[PDB]
């Protein structure tokens, strides 16, 4: 469980993401694909994109980044009370996309990297801690729902 303080830190930095959701979403996906190129295969959509520049020009990648962050944002704003938001996400990701928990770790690392790159002044150790805990909670809960659905990823 996070403390109220911890949630406030998460949501304060998240308000900065919300100033430019698309641009944050692009940076996060590109960082994920750069750092762990195997994930780009579990994205048949724009898995063909060959340079950083093509990635930044892709309207389809940009739109997806907004869809990912909007869903994560809605989850974080529930401060742990996220069953109704998380269940459908687990369903899709376990049964259709087949995304292992390790890939949720990879994108969590990308989120943290981009938040610190863009907002160092609102993303010091205490804020990093808090966001790390929120993303851990998300992954723990999603993994439990994966298992319920019969997916051990
Ligand atoms: C913070 C983590 C994540 C969030 C919040 C998230 C959210 C979403 C959302 C909302 C959708 C569209 C609705 C749905 O199909 O569920 C989506 C689709 C998808 N996600 Fe994720 N996702 C996350 C992580 C990942 C990772 C790490 C991968 C692959 C490495 C992945 C692969 C996909 C794919 C393949 C689709 C289908 C897209 C399409 O065909 O248009 N997701 N995700």
Swiss-Prot record:
Keywords, alphabetical: Cytoplasm, Heme, Iron, Metal-binding, Muscle protein, Oxidoreductase, Oxygen transport, Phosphoprotein, Transport
Pfam families found in the cross-reference section: Globin (PF00042)
Top-rank lineage group of the source organism: Eukaryota
Enzymatic class: oxidoreductase
All residue ranges annotated as the Globin domain in the record: 1-147
Binding residue positions for O2: 64
Coiled-coil intervals: none
UniProt GO BP: removal of superoxide radicals
Gene Ontology cellular-component annotations: extracellular exosome; sarcoplasm
Annotated positions binding nitrite: 64
Gene3D superfamilies to which the protein is assigned, alphabetical: 6.10.140.2100, 6.10.140.2110
Keyword Cell inner membrane included in the entry's annotation: no
Location in or out of the cell: Cytoplasm, Sarcoplasm
Residues binding heme b: 93
Modified residue annotations for Phosphoserine: 3
Modified residues (Phosphothreonine): 67
Annotated InterPro entries: Globin, Globin-like_sf, Myoglobin
Catalysed reaction equations from the record: Fe(III)-heme b-[protein] + nitric oxide + H2O = Fe(II)-heme b-[protein] + nitrite + 2 H(+); H2O2 + AH2 = A + 2 H2O
EC number per UniProt: 1.7.-.-, 1.11.1.-
Subunit structure: Monomeric.
Family: Belongs to the globin family.
PANTHER family, alphabetized: MYOGLOBIN
Primary role: Monomeric heme protein which primary function is to store oxygen and facilitate its diffusion within muscle tissues. Reversibly binds oxygen through a pentacoordinated heme iron and enables its timely and efficient release as needed during periods of heightened demand. Depending on the oxidative conditions of tissues and cells, and in addition to its ability to bind oxygen, it also has a nitrite reductase activity whereby it regulates the production of bioactive nitric oxide.
Protein's UniProt name: Myoglobin
Gene that this sequence comes from: MB
């Amino acid at each position: 469980v996070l403390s109220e303080g911890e949630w406030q830190l998460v949501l304060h930095v998240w308000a900065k993401v919300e100033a430019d959701v698309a641009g944050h979403g692009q940076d996060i996906l590109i960082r994920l694909f750069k750092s762990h190129p195997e994930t780009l295969e579990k994205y048949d959509r724009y898995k063909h994109l060959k340079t950083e520049a093509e990635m930044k020009a892709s309207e389809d990648l940009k739109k997806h980044g907004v869809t990912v962050l909007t869903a994560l944002g809605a989850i974080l704003k529930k401060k742990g009370h996220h069953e109704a938001e998380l269940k459908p996400l687990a369903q899709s990701h376990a049964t259709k996309h087949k995304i292992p928990i390790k890939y949720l770790e990879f994108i969590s690392e990308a989120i943290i990297h981009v938040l610190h790159s863009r907002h160092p002044g609102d993303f010091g150790a205490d804020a990093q801690g808090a966001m790390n805990k929120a993303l851990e909670l998300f992954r723990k809960d999603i993994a439990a729902k994966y298992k319920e659905l019969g997916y051990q990823g």
